[PDB]
């Protein structure tokens with residue numbers, strides 16, 4: 001029953017992870033937007049000393065979000081939050097019960113975090129070459145069950161971990177968002193439409209189809225607009241190699 | 242009844258993380274060293290096609306390590322492995338039971354993976370400036386309970402995640418091992434001996450005192466020797482500004 005507050009921002013795929021898990025848990029919770037990149041509020045370091053989004057407070061007295069309680073637990077780091085939601089809500093089966101299937105879920109999150117997320121970040125925010133990101137996405141795709149399903153078979157927090165970023169990639173490419181070259185945008189677009197990535201396309205579609213996504217997504221159009229506010233997304237700038 | 246094989250390498254802190262958890266778990270297991278950085282066996286991509294240490298097999302018929310079975314579960318990524326071992330040995334209490342303390346464990350691992358490991362890498366492999374690593378260590382020291390204890394109070398896999406790296410840092414610094422200058426090496430040794438870092442020195446002592454560390458650590462001088470065999474550590478080489 002203890003309260004849950006998630007501090008969030010529409011553009012943020014990390015915050016999006018946790019909204020999805022909270023929907024899949026059926027949790028009662030409060031979200032509060034934080035302009036973390038343009039105008040961080042002065043109280044925000046009390047909920048997260050690291051000054052990143054998402055931030056979560058857990059239990060303590062019901063306060064307004066801009067009036068955080070010292071008595072609430074402050075949880076940082078979106079993957080830690082997903083595991084926490086799974087622990088709080090075992091009835092929701094947000095992880096398998098079998099230890100091998102659970103390791104499948106954990107390995108998928110690790111593969112994404114360690115080899116994929118850094119490429120999305122560099123390609124989009126630094127304009128680094130696209131080929132290593134497509135390699136890493138082919139690798140991640142190879143970890144999926146071949147005949148359909150989610151990362152560990154049944155949906156789990158592994159899929160909440162990963163869909164926010166894969167679901168952003170297609171519309172951002174179509175909107176031309178990112179500091180990569182024209183040449184790599186075409187390459188990525190043709191690639192993500194090619195037979196080689198059909199499996200990851202089916203996985204995006206399957207995850208997007210769940211209420212947890214539809215209820216945490218502003219719409220492709222609106223998410224593009226939100227991304228367009230990110231300072232690092234310096235419009236009119238591209239890098240070439 | 243299910244067999245565990247860990248493919249290992251003495252120099253590897255990621256392999257070392259999983260050895261420590263297995264010792265804490267009371268597990269029955271086999272380790273098999275792989276010269277991954279210099280002469281990888283060709284069967285190796287059969288247990289981990291990412292070609293990385295550690296690798297793990299679980300179950301299947303008991304075969305010699307160098308003849309893996311296509312029937313064993315192949316588990317990759319050391320943090321996935323730590324969670325797997327905690328799932329396999331719940332009577333060993335490798336994580337807390339309380340959800341908030343579990344979240345402490347998960348957050349500390351994410352902080353190290355997300356903000357510290359990349360800095361060690363930068364400083365030791367590219368000899369970049371030492372100061373952002375010291376800040377990130379102070380951040381991580383800040384997450385520990387100030388008056389004593391491990392990351393989550395009781396010992397947990399979060400400690401297995403982190404001590405392989407911290408425990409290596411001190412002897413490598415004594416050895417000049419790494420691409421950083423003498424000057425940054427001095428600054429780092431002085432810093433890690435100053436009162437600023439008393440708490441993280443305590444944590445390393447407390448982790449190193451447990452048998453799980455003793456039984457998985459070849460000795461300070463031996464671990465240094467193994468580290469010299471790592472090409473990217475480029476022994477006798479140093480960068481200056």
Ligand SMILES: O=C(c1ccccc1)c1ccc(O)c(O)c1O
Nearest residue numbers: 013117120121124165166168169
């Ligand atoms: O928004 C994105 C993003 C998401 C999908 C594709 C490209 C970029 C993003 C990706 C990594 C990050 O580390 C990060 O902070 C970010 O905002």
Ligand SMILES: O=C(c1ccccc1)c1ccc(O)c(O)c1O
Nearest residue numbers: 254358361362365406409410413
């Ligand atoms: O071995 C080390 C290392 C250990 C202690 C201090 C400095 C570096 C290490 C650190 C990051 C890595 O990504 C990695 O592969 C590594 O081997």
Ligand SMILES: [Ca+2]
Nearest residue numbers: 141142143144
């Ligand atoms: Ca496969």
